[PDB]
């Protein structure tokens, strides 16, 4: 049975995943395909 | 015979570094070279 902790923690996991996808795509549009070594390297 | 001989204003042992092939490049260490060059410069100036 779905005890309510399971459902909320699932929602928090997918919310964190949607967040990480969003800021990862923010990094993708800001930088392009690149290793996260540094942005100071990619500032050139 | 004649020459000026001046020992440099003689300093501390130093922070002291240079890359390795400069050993094969450079000939004499800078205390002797500064002795010769500072001797020449001070000789010309004190002659004037």
């Amino acid at each position: 049975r779905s005890d309510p902790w399971v459902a909320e923690a699932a929602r928090r996991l997918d919310a964190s995943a949607a967040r990480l996808a969003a800021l990862r795509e923010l990094y993708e549009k800001e930088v392009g395909p690149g290793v996260p070594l540094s942005g100071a390297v990619l500032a050139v | 015979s004649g020459e000026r001989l001046v020992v440099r204003l003689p300093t501390y042992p130093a922070f002291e570094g240079y890359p390795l092939s400069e050993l094969d490049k450079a000939r004499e260490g800078e205390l002797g070279a500064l002795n010769r060059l500072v001797a020449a410069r001070t000789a010309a100036a004190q002659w004037a």
């Binding site: - | 042992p13 130093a14 002291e16 800078e30």
Partner: protein, 176 residues
């Protein structure tokens, strides 16, 4: 009594130059079972060669000439070698503490002269330090501990010529 002298030390007295300094001579006291108050003269002799090999010798005996002779020969038995910069100053700053005495020792550029207390002037002229500013702190009331402390404090420092073979990194340009 007889003091000892070896064979291979007899290339050194014919070898280097040498100077001798008595540090202090001291009269200690002991009341003993049976006859009374027995004293010994404790004498402390330093000996260097003014090129960076230093020695200390502590001697104990019943009379002053024999005590100073024993410490005189004990120092000349016991020699340690100390690196200098071209025979006038030490490589680093030097701080040390024997028994509880705070010596502080600095290098000075050559021709500073010795700015230096009493017995340590003859000590630095003995081993070959021409240009060093020192101060000793704590209870300075003993000559013996500043002598031993100075020997260890000379032995503390570090040498640059043990690198250039194995560091890949050449060590020159002393221009300030």
């Amino acid at each position: 009594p007889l003091p000892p002298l070896p064979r291979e030390l007899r290339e050194a007295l014919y070898g280097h130059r040498w100077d001798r300094v008595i540090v202090d001579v001291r009269r200690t006291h002991t009341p003993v079972r049976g006859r009374g108050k027995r004293e010994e003269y404790t004498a402390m002799v330093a000996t260097g060669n003014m090129r960076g090999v230093f020695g200390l010798g502590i001697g104990v005996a019943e009379s002053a000439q024999l005590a100073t002779a024993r410490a005189h020969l004990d120092s000349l038995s016991r020699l340690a070698a100390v690196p200098l910069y071209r025979g006038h100053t030490l490589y680093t700053h030097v701080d040390h503490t024997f028994h509880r005495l705070s010596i502080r020792m600095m290098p000075r550029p050559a021709g500073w002269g010795l700015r230096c207390p009493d017995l340590l002037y003859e000590l630095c002229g003995l081993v070959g330090l021409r240009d060093v500013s020192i101060r000793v702190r704590g209870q300075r009331g003993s000559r013996f501990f500043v002598a031993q402390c100075f020997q260890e404090a000379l032995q503390k420092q570090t040498t640059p010529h043990d690198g250039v073979e194995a560091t890949g990194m050449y060590i020159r340009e002393v221009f300030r």
